[PDB]
Amino acid sequence: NQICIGKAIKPINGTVETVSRMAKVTGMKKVGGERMQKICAKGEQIHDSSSACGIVSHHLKQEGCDFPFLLNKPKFATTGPMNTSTTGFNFYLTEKAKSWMNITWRVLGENKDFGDNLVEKYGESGATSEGATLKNYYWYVPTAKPGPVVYEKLAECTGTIYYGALLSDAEAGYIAVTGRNVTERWDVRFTGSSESSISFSGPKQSPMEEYIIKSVRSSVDTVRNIIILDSGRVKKGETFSISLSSGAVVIPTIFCDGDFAVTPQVQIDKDCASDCHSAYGSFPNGSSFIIHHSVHTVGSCPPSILRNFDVIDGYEATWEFFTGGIQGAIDGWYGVTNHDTGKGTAADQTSTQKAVEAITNKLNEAIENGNQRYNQLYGLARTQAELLGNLGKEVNDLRLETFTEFIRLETILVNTRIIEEHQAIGSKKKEEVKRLLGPNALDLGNGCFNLTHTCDSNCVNSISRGTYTRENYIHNVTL
Amino acid sequence: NQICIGKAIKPINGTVETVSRMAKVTGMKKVGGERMQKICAKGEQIHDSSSACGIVSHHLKQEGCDFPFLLNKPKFATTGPMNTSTTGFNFYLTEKAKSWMNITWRVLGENKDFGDNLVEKYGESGATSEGATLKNYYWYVPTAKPGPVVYEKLAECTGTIYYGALLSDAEAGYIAVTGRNVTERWDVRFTGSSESSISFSGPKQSPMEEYIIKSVRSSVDTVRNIIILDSGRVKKGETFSISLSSGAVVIPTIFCDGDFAVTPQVQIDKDCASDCHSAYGSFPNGSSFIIHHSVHTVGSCPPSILRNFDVIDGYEATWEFFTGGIQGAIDGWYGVTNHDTGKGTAADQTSTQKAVEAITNKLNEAIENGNQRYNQLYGLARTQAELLGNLGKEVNDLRLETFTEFIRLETILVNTRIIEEHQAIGSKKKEEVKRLLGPNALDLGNGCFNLTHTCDSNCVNSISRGTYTRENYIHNVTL
Amino acid sequence: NQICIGKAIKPINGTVETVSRMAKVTGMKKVGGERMQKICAKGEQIHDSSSACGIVSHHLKQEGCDFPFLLNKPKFATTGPMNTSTTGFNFYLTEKAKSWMNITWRVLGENKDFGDNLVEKYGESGATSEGATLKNYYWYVPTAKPGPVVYEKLAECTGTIYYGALLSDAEAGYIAVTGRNVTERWDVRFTGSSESSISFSGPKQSPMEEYIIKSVRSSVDTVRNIIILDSGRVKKGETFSISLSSGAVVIPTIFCDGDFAVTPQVQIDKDCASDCHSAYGSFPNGSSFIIHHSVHTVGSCPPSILRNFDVIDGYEATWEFFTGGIQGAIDGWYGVTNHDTGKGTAADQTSTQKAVEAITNKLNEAIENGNQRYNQLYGLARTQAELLGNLGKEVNDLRLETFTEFIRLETILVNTRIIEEHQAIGSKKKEEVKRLLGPNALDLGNGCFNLTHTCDSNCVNSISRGTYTRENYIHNVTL
Ligand SMILES: *[C@@H]1O[C@H](CO)[C@@H](O[C@@H]2O[C@H](CO)[C@@H](O[C@@H]3O[C@H](CO[C@@H]4O[C@H](CO)[C@@H](O)[C@H](O[C@@H]5O[C@H](CO)[C@@H](O)[C@H](O)[C@@H]5O[C@@H]5O[C@H](CO)[C@@H](O)[C@H](O)[C@@H]5O)[C@@H]4O)[C@@H](O)[C@H](O)[C@@H]3O)[C@H](O)[C@H]2NC(C)=O)[C@H](O)[C@H]1NC(C)=O
Ligand SMILES: *[C@@H]1O[C@H](CO)[C@@H](O[C@@H]2O[C@H](CO)[C@@H](O[C@@H]3O[C@H](CO[C@@H]4O[C@H](CO)[C@@H](O)[C@H](O[C@@H]5O[C@H](CO)[C@@H](O)[C@H](O)[C@@H]5O[C@@H]5O[C@H](CO)[C@@H](O)[C@H](O)[C@@H]5O)[C@@H]4O)[C@@H](O)[C@H](O)[C@@H]3O)[C@H](O)[C@H]2NC(C)=O)[C@H](O)[C@H]1NC(C)=O
Ligand SMILES: *[C@@H]1O[C@H](CO)[C@@H](O[C@@H]2O[C@H](CO)[C@@H](O[C@@H]3O[C@H](CO[C@@H]4O[C@H](CO)[C@@H](O)[C@H](O[C@@H]5O[C@H](CO)[C@@H](O)[C@H](O)[C@@H]5O[C@@H]5O[C@H](CO)[C@@H](O)[C@H](O)[C@@H]5O)[C@@H]4O)[C@@H](O)[C@H](O)[C@@H]3O)[C@H](O)[C@H]2NC(C)=O)[C@H](O)[C@H]1NC(C)=O
Ligand SMILES: *[C@@H]1O[C@H](CO)[C@@H](O[C@@H]2O[C@H](CO)[C@@H](O)[C@H](O)[C@H]2NC(C)=O)[C@H](O)[C@H]1NC(C)=O
Ligand SMILES: *[C@@H]1O[C@H](CO)[C@@H](O[C@@H]2O[C@H](CO)[C@@H](O)[C@H](O)[C@H]2NC(C)=O)[C@H](O)[C@H]1NC(C)=O
Ligand SMILES: *[C@@H]1O[C@H](CO)[C@@H](O[C@@H]2O[C@H](CO)[C@@H](O)[C@H](O)[C@H]2NC(C)=O)[C@H](O)[C@H]1NC(C)=O
Ligand SMILES: *[C@@H]1O[C@H](CO)[C@@H](O)[C@H](O)[C@H]1NC(C)=O
Ligand SMILES: *[C@@H]1O[C@H](CO)[C@@H](O)[C@H](O)[C@H]1NC(C)=O
Ligand SMILES: *[C@@H]1O[C@H](CO)[C@@H](O)[C@H](O)[C@H]1NC(C)=O
Ligand SMILES: *[C@@H]1O[C@H](CO)[C@@H](O)[C@H](O)[C@H]1NC(C)=O
Ligand SMILES: *[C@@H]1O[C@H](CO)[C@@H](O)[C@H](O)[C@H]1NC(C)=O
Ligand SMILES: *[C@@H]1O[C@H](CO)[C@@H](O)[C@H](O)[C@H]1NC(C)=O
Ligand SMILES: *[C@@H]1O[C@H](CO)[C@@H](O)[C@H](O)[C@H]1NC(C)=O
Ligand SMILES: *[C@@H]1O[C@H](CO)[C@@H](O)[C@H](O)[C@H]1NC(C)=O
Ligand SMILES: *[C@@H]1O[C@H](CO)[C@@H](O)[C@H](O)[C@H]1NC(C)=O
Ligand SMILES: *[C@@H]1O[C@H](CO)[C@@H](O)[C@H](O)[C@H]1NC(C)=O
Ligand SMILES: *[C@@H]1O[C@H](CO)[C@@H](O)[C@H](O)[C@H]1NC(C)=O
Ligand SMILES: *[C@@H]1O[C@H](CO)[C@@H](O)[C@H](O)[C@H]1NC(C)=O
């Protein structure tokens, strides 16, 4: 009789978008992973000191508040608010100091110390009885006042340094310590990778009057000392300089850049593990992209996007009289039949696995291209702490918006390439049958052949393995 | 004889650009609307006070200059230049104050007042005889000088606040009012969503000497008072603070953000109406995009672009021996003929209307995509006043340049999709005829069939409605 | 017998990337030019004063250091480091001054002078014996001190102006010159296209103490004068103002913007010429794009990119029983044969030259589009000096990264268009032969015809120039 080849009919599932049209497919999936409803923290440590410490207390090494000086640092931390009192002095901070101290207290790297150099250069530090419980500071009080100097040093890592002043609100103490006159203004300047400065004057003058009013009082109500801070930045291989006068203060530590821990905001669950966490949940194992609105994460995580897209997973449906589909039931994507159901239908295997492999190859290439584009956009030598510190109070990142469009543009090309490859694979099989049958059989030109003799089920399945021969089927003639 | 189907030949009009080639089409149009030569302002109000007021006079509520305190505000306004004198004090402004006052005097929203809170907190305001014609200011003069304080308040909308000082150039008055010494420097600071400050000193010192020289004199030549201003920004839900000392001044009003009117620059015409206006003309009704170089407009207007593009409006011309065109005259885009003119040609209707609808569908989808991209680029909660205030003196916007390329990229995809859809529509009609005629008629494979018998005009037009039958045409045989 | 037409088989060279697939081609090239290992400077002048001058000495017109006051300026220059001493005063610079003097000393344009206006407005300049070897400065010392003034002037070009102070470290000299008190602070302000200021006080006070310590000493060890500088910017058509008090100093010259020379970093070679040079080498003649990481160059150079790409140069290979290739040896890209080698094969010429011209046309259009995009990105009225001055210490430019992706996107479209045009050219030739042979010869449908009679070598080459006739080949019949 006659034989035909083609695909197997399956119900339609969805539609995808290509360059020139919309296609109907029997299966599709997504590229991104979705957030969970909890945090999986099996085999981890959690640090919590929300009842005793504050943000400032950690920097100054108060008694019992020493997160940044530990050998092993947990990846989850929580502490009190920024306006929490201490047990030593009263303190005042500027806006930049607040912005950088929101981050610098929980870095996961190593910190550098240079107090001994100052001690050996200028002698012993000043002493007071109101700071018995604090350790990390250096007070410059020379014998001859004011005696300005300039201190220069070569840095070791990239990070931030805090500097400022420490003064009392009594006029007699101010005159005895500074050695200046009340009706004067004097500055402290920091020059590094950038430039910064701060100004001071007498107690009953500007701008010290505002500092006294805006300060945060301490637990002990008999403390008369206020310390005012500000920040500056350094670089690894260069030299930084500070101008010093009698009365200035500096914290002798460099907080090197790196990664910082996250603060949980949802319920914490044990007895389950993962490898990528955020402040609002975890993510599934082995993902290629993450649906997130920032770049702050702990663990090993892929890049981030703002929304999700669809990618083909099956094959296109092109059918409704032969049209290209086979009504039989077969365990494959391609088949050969002779208008018989149950025994007159057979399936091949090579085309199925080739079509399977094409998708994986194309998807891997697209993922690699996306990774390279991300690296170009953000740079090879990047640090999360610096990236989030530079943003400040802004919650919108333009680079994420720029990156999101690239994936949307790439998905269409991926779909088009996959479909064209499937068509190319399908085209070749039709040629291997025409040359195999010979030139004595006519072809309908629509994938269905029509043979000179009768072709039974064995005739059909012998073609599938390709061991077909013409010698034993010559008998009888029919059209 | 034989019959053929195809399109109708029409003269060529232009060319369009697709992904892979340039196409020749019989009709095209544009996406953007062009500016007019005048302003259509029928049924509108125009405000003009160019002969009496100035920009500063409006903020201080001078006698007869009260634009920002009206229930109904017109959409067109004009006033005098910025260096126009007043009838009260002498005044001095900084650069930021000038930049923001170029806009804040003509907002179309609501303004908030908080003078009563200050009055009930610190008592009555200071009094002088040189400001009898002004109302909108508060002067802080306590009994004990200087007496610094800090004032904190929770805001209601998002906007700008002006603050500064008011002093005389006589030494005795300065000492009597401020209560300080001449050889001193004192500051006023504003902290909100950002930070700002300003400094003052005695009359025969810096920087007051420059303030005296650079000031703008008043109409009355016996005024000895200069008021110096500066600006700051607030946010809706947060708290803002001001540092006050004896002698400072603040204008107790918040100018909320929103839209502001335009100043006509061309001839104004009545007796004609529109719904979108700019400073250089109006735009036609019902446009989808606007050819304009800014985002400042009044009314209901679509997004803006920097140049214009072309979009297909007819069908592609593919012809020069049959080639695919019909030389007859028909009232449609598709037809059937038998090499006869006048009576041997007929036209169908379904294909024409389907091809008509495809263009509308594709164009609507493209427009929606463009709107979504614009919203992503600029943000959902946006205000024109803030957007133009942040730019400053720059006249080039990069976001418009980024947005312009997106439309150019989208137009090519639109054209490609439309052409492919037209080809898909055309392909199906050829199949419905082969199955209708039957298997006893050969096909030339180029859209022309060739029938076994003679096929007259009734034979031709019966096919058009699809009521063709084979029983009554069997007689005679010819090839 | 039978005849066939097609291409000529050549070995495969490489692969290129298109919209929907990867193609195999017999030839390809690149779009960008690569750097050399030296500098070609035949017929050029080189300036070198690394042994006597410094950067600061050039601005002040020291004896023998006068680069910015020459009629003809060489395109290569080199001088000493920034901290080189002079023979006059001691000097101090800020960060912005350093950043701008890294560039302004080697501009190739014209500079403007306005000293005579100052002389005629305020009289003769101050005189000192420590600056006998310097000429380019103006010192304001009026008879009555301090006597502040404001100086306003309309500019001529766009550029930078340096201003500041000149003072001694002795208390008596300070009091005698300035006419102020030691416990005071006074400022100098510059308002133009932007705003800037600087502050000064007494010798044993802040911030003069830091200035004295950080200064650079002069060759003569008996000089007691320090000059402190800062910078400001102007615009062509506007007015700029300066606040002056007794003791200020200004350099009366405007350094107009333009191009500046390069400093060689590699070996310099004569006896060879080019037309585009950089600091690390030269580039080949007649290039369309340059592989560079900046926009600083001298000569006539095209735009710059960060990496290189591939562009097709031959024709696609589509073959492995005829498949479309001819095994004969021909001097062309297309040919006709009759399964005979040596004398039964001929080549045409028109198709070859048409295919050659298509590539040139498409490439030229792409290059023009790229040029227009570059002009849109950077602006029509641009200056290298201003562009690099605004960047500062940053070594990464985002606009180059944005521009690099455009070329990568354009190359794919170029390849697709070229391939489609080649297919369109190839398709038409097959039609001109079917109509020429007539309707009495069958066609195999794969580019090979099959004729009713025998067709020899003269028969083959008769088709080549198209003068074939059917009358003399009618004899005999065969299939
Ligand atoms: C010290 O530094 C810390 C680190 O920077 C500071 O932490 C930030 O604090 C902010 C104040 O609380 C906080 O902002 C909040 O964010 C919350 C986010 O949770 C929401 O959950 C919703 C579902 O329940 C989401 O719908 C919502 O938005 C979505 O986010 C998706 C990503 O998961 C997007 O794909 C979606 O499009 C969707 O919309 C986005 O919203 C973003 C804003 O959240 C927006 O930027 C983006 O463009 C999309 O439009 C969101 O996920 C909100 O519920 C709160 O209302 C509030 O906005 C920051 O997130 C904190 N930063 C980080 C990195 O977590 C800390 O404040 C600082 N300390 C001090 C004292 O300043
Ligand atoms: C208070 O705030 C106000 C609001 O910001 C300030 O108003 C601005 O004042 C500026 C100074 O006058 C003014 O700049 C002028 O703009 C005019 C524009 O008119 C021109 O008309 C020509 C035809 O006759 C056009 O060819 C020309 O440019 C075109 O614009 C098309 C859009 O319509 C573009 O599609 C074209 O490409 C073309 O070229 C553009 O030109 C733009 C500059 O105009 C350029 O930015 C863009 O990239 C294209 O290259 C233009 O339309 C000019 O004639 C004047 O020469 C001058 O440039 C601003 O437009 C005002 N702002 C607004 C929003 O109108 C006000 O100054 C301020 N007060 C104070 C004291 O500062
Ligand atoms: C006054 O102004 C001057 C002008 O701005 C200042 O000159 C700058 O001085 C810098 C300090 O020396 C200098 O930075 C150096 O650049 C060198 C570049 O030479 C390298 O050669 C290598 C081959 O041997 C390349 O591999 C290397 O990088 C490549 O560059 C290619 C372009 O040729 C790119 O296509 C490649 O991708 C590749 O990688 C790039 O590197 C770039 C950094 O160089 C990077 O920005 C880019 O994104 C790519 O990643 C490079 O070509 C280095 O060897 C040195 O290590 C150092 O980085 C600047 O180049 C100078 N500026 C100019 C315009 O030349 C001068 O400092 C200033 N005076 C003062 C006192 O400040
Ligand atoms: C997701 O990946 C994590 C990898 O950290 C898996 O956690 C490990 O699972 C293996 C397999 O049982 C255990 O031997 C390890 O002890 C686990 N790690 C830890 C730290 O306990 C986790 O099982 C994976 N989850 C899923 C669903 O596959
Ligand atoms: C453009 O649209 C405006 C919409 O404001 C039209 O103005 C209105 O036109 C209708 C129809 O005559 C009138 O009844 C209204 O009174 C008009 N509005 C006002 C405020 O007077 C305008 O006619 C339209 N123009 C064109 C050419 O269509
Ligand atoms: C590259 O172009 C330069 C153009 O400046 C060529 O230099 C000129 O070459 C011509 C031809 O011999 C000479 O007559 C000129 O005198 C050269 N210019 C100078 C300034 O000497 C150079 O020869 C070209 N190089 C190549 C390899 O083509
Ligand atoms: C194909 O074969 C079937 C049965 O053998 C026959 O009915 C049909 O006419 C054949 N078709 C052609 C085109 O020969
Ligand atoms: C498509 O397949 C998925 C996977 O099984 C299934 O969840 C979904 O319901 C299917 N779509 C439809 C419309 O049935
Ligand atoms: C400290 O800050 C928290 C943050 O909301 C606030 O509730 C609390 O009132 C503040 N403490 C004081 C003393 O103002
Ligand atoms: C303070 O001023 C007085 C008088 O002006 C002066 O005698 C004294 O030396 C000054 N003190 C300092 C530390 O400068
Ligand atoms: C088509 O019909 C016409 C007239 O009936 C005839 O001249 C021509 O040869 C026919 N073509 C074919 C291919 O049969
Ligand atoms: C194309 O059609 C428009 C609309 O009628 C017409 O204005 C234009 O002249 C036409 N183009 C040509 C080349 O005739
Ligand atoms: C005020 O500004 C205008 C703007 O051009 C100017 O013409 C006028 O001279 C200025 N008035 C004074 C007094 O300078
Ligand atoms: C001004 O200075 C003098 C002397 O230095 C002092 O007696 C007087 O109290 C000062 N006045 C004020 C308001 O500080
Ligand atoms: C083509 O011609 C050759 C020789 O003339 C012959 O062997 C072959 O069968 C012909 N092919 C067809 C389809 O007629
Ligand atoms: C491709 O052609 C170029 C030009 O001659 C040659 O240098 C290169 O080796 C060729 N490629 C291969 C793989 O032979
Ligand atoms: C001047 O700068 C160079 C730059 O490296 C440095 O080597 C030299 O030591 C500096 N001179 C002085 C006196 O510091
Ligand atoms: C400096 O101060 C003294 C006392 O305060 C005063 O007598 C003298 O006039 C002042 N000198 C100047 C130049 O202001």
UniProtKB/TrEMBL annotation, chains A, B, C:
Domain of life: Viruses
Recorded coiled-coil stretches: none
Keyword Cytoplasm appears in the UniProt entry: no
Glycosylated residues (UniProt): 13, 83, 181, 450
GO MF annotation: an example: host cell surface receptor binding
Protein name per its UniProtKB record: Hemagglutinin
Disulfide bonds: 4-448, 53-65, 157-256, 276-301, 455-459
Alphabetical list of InterPro entries matching this protein: Hemagglutn_influenz_A/B (IPR001364), Hemagglutn_influenz_B (IPR000386)
Record GO cellular component, one term: viral envelope
BP GO annotations: endocytosis involved in viral entry into host cell; fusion of virus membrane with host plasma membrane
Keywords associated with the record: Membrane, Transmembrane, Transmembrane helix, Viral penetration into host cytoplasm, Virus endocytosis by host, Virus entry into host cell
